[PDB]
Design a protein around this ligand. Structure first.
Ligand SMILES: COC(=O)N1CCC[C@H](C(=O)Nc2ccc(Cl)c(F)c2)C1
Ligand SMILES: *[C@@H]1O[C@H](CO)[C@@H](O)[C@H](O)[C@H]1NC(C)=O
Ligand SMILES: *[C@@H]1O[C@H](CO)[C@@H](O)[C@H](O)[C@H]1NC(C)=O
Ligand SMILES: *[C@@H]1O[C@H](CO)[C@@H](O)[C@H](O)[C@H]1NC(C)=O
Ligand SMILES: *[C@@H]1O[C@H](CO)[C@@H](O)[C@H](O)[C@H]1NC(C)=O
Ligand SMILES: *[C@@H]1O[C@H](CO)[C@@H](O)[C@H](O)[C@H]1NC(C)=O
Ligand SMILES: *[C@@H]1O[C@H](CO)[C@@H](O)[C@H](O)[C@H]1NC(C)=O
Ligand SMILES: *[C@@H]1O[C@H](CO)[C@@H](O)[C@H](O)[C@H]1NC(C)=O
Ligand SMILES: *[C@@H]1O[C@H](CO)[C@@H](O)[C@H](O)[C@H]1NC(C)=O
Ligand SMILES: *[C@@H]1O[C@H](CO)[C@@H](O)[C@H](O)[C@H]1NC(C)=O
Ligand SMILES: *[C@@H]1O[C@H](CO)[C@@H](O)[C@H](O)[C@H]1NC(C)=O
Ligand SMILES: *[C@@H]1O[C@H](CO)[C@@H](O)[C@H](O)[C@H]1NC(C)=O
Length: 341
């Protein structure tokens, strides 16, 4: 059919409800068009196409969208940016992500890799074309990727360069793991419950898959090596509240029989004052709503950074990472790319 690699401005589509006060719905109601009522995916016969999830302008575009959404939607009591501050009103909002589709304009199409074990870079042999991506939830989080899609076959390790330890690793799970987080009815104290059995089994498999890529070496997990709390903790937004959860128990190493196939309870705190993931500085929000604040989510992936300086050692050490939300969008946009017809 003839196409070439190209960049261009996308638009978005949604099933947002015009009658909803939820912020993602409000934003998508006025910034996206309705979802394609009859989506058509066209398989491309005997077509091999190179992809590179690490060099994908769709990622930067979605990133700019979600920045826009959060800036219009979240109302901090005070926000400190660029040697300045502005104080406002900060009402509690309705907050629950909805899927967003990304669609090409005229003269362009989206190619979709359906190779089940595709790692994000290189050739894809089973390629289709679509007018829009599937609906992607823009879930902001560190350490754990939440409410995403799953790898269809095996656990996938995605990295721009595994030998470069400064390059973030995205682990794509093939089996979701529930994380159930609650502030019951100290108002800022909360906790997350994870099935230890389910989690440790998944984690043992992740270690095995990491061993395949690192010449059979010993794989050890460690807590983050300092930084801001947003990256030292699993950080996410739950119904408008910013949860900071300690994941030391998640990355034990011991449980990979010692009394650890029960429930894992991670200590959390709701924080009013955060370091924004947009990079702009510090923001302060209002105290949490009264009553039971609950969010149950699927762990669909893991963000990891590997220690340096272990070349002459027998081990490789991995720590939960994150903070660059582009990697969150990357973990869902990896199989898409825009081409010009
Ligand atoms: C990594 O380098 C940076 O520029 N950062 C500055 C310090 C951490 C910040 C961050 O990740 N904040 C955040 C806020 C809210 C949520 Cl719900 C979240 F999941 C992450 C990113
Ligand atoms: C991804 O697959 C390509 C082969 O097409 C290979 O060059 C690259 O090392 C792989 N990356 C990872 C992280 O497995
Ligand atoms: C090609 O990908 C399609 C679309 O996901 C999928 O049904 C299947 O795995 C592949 N089909 C063939 C004939 O290989
Ligand atoms: C979590 O995963 C299960 C199956 O793995 C799925 O049925 C459920 O809808 C998922 N929840 C969300 C919020 O995606
Ligand atoms: C997930 O992938 C691993 C290999 O990485 C495999 O051993 C396991 O059976 C897979 N699980 C499912 C449910 O497909
Ligand atoms: C990957 O990183 C290593 C170490 O930083 C570097 O020597 C190598 O050239 C990199 N590979 C590519 C393809 O950039
Ligand atoms: C989540 O945890 C809360 C508090 O522990 C509990 O009331 C609720 O039943 C749990 N929900 C699920 C879906 O497991
Ligand atoms: C963990 O998953 C097992 C299945 O392996 C299930 O029977 C049980 O409900 C779960 N236990 C906890 C404590 O979540
Ligand atoms: C890693 O060790 C396994 C046995 O545990 C072996 O089958 C495999 O050949 C080794 N890795 C590679 C890349 O050969
Ligand atoms: C997480 O909890 C452990 C104890 O389980 C504690 O030593 C550590 O300081 C906590 N992490 C942070 C960032 O406070
Ligand atoms: C898991 O986490 C902590 C280590 O700080 C501890 O409660 C426990 O002994 C560890 N290992 C096992 C097998 O439970
Ligand atoms: C994940 O999805 C569930 C169901 O859609 C929702 O209740 C939960 O709040 C979501 N988690 C996050 C962190 O958005």
């Amino acid at each position: 059919p003839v196409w070439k690699d190209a960049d261009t401005t996308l638009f978005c589509a949604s099933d947002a409800k015009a009658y909803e006060t939820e912020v993602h719905n409000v934003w998508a109601t006025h910034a996206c068009v309705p979802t394609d009522p009859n989506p058509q995916e066209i398989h491309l016969e005997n077509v091999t196409e190179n992809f590179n999830m690490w060099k994908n302008n769709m990622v930067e575009q979605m990133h700019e969208d979600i920045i826009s959404l959060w800036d219009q939607s979240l109302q901090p009591c005070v926000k400190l940016t660029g040697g300045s501050v502005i104080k406002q009103a900060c009402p509690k909002i309705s907050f629950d992500p909805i899927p967003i589709h990304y669609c090409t304009p005229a003269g362009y199409v989206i190619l979709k890799c359906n190779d089940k074990n595709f790692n994000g870079t290189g050739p894809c042999k089973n390629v289709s074309s679509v007018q829009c991506t599937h609906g992607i939830k823009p879930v902001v989080s560190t350490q754990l990727l939440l409410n995403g899609s799953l790898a269809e076959e095996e656990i996938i390790i995605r990295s721009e360069n595994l030998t470069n330890n400064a390059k973030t690793i995205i682990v794509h799970l093939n089996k979701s793991v529930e994380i159930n987080c609650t502030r019951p009815s100290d108002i800022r104290k909360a906790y997350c419950e994870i099935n230890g059995t389910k989690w440790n089994k998944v984690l043992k498999q992740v270690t095995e898959k990491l061993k395949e890529h690192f010449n059979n070496k010993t794989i050890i997990f460690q807590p983050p090596s300092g930084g801001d709390l947003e990256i030292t903790m699993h950080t996410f937004n739950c119904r408008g509240e910013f949860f900071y959860c300690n994941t030391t128990q998640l990355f034990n190493n011991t449980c990979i029989m010692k009394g650890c196939n029960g429930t894992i309870t991670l200590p959390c705190k709701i924080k009013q004052i955060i370091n924004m993931w947009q990079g702009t500085g510090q923001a302060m929000y209002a105290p949490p709503i009264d009553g039971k604040i609950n969010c149950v989510s699927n762990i669909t992936g893991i963000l990891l950074t590997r220690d340096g300086g272990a070349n002459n050692t027998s081990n490789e050490t991995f720590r939960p990472g994150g903070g660059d939300m582009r990697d969150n969008w990357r973990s869902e946009l990896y199989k898409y790319k825009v081409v010009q017809i």
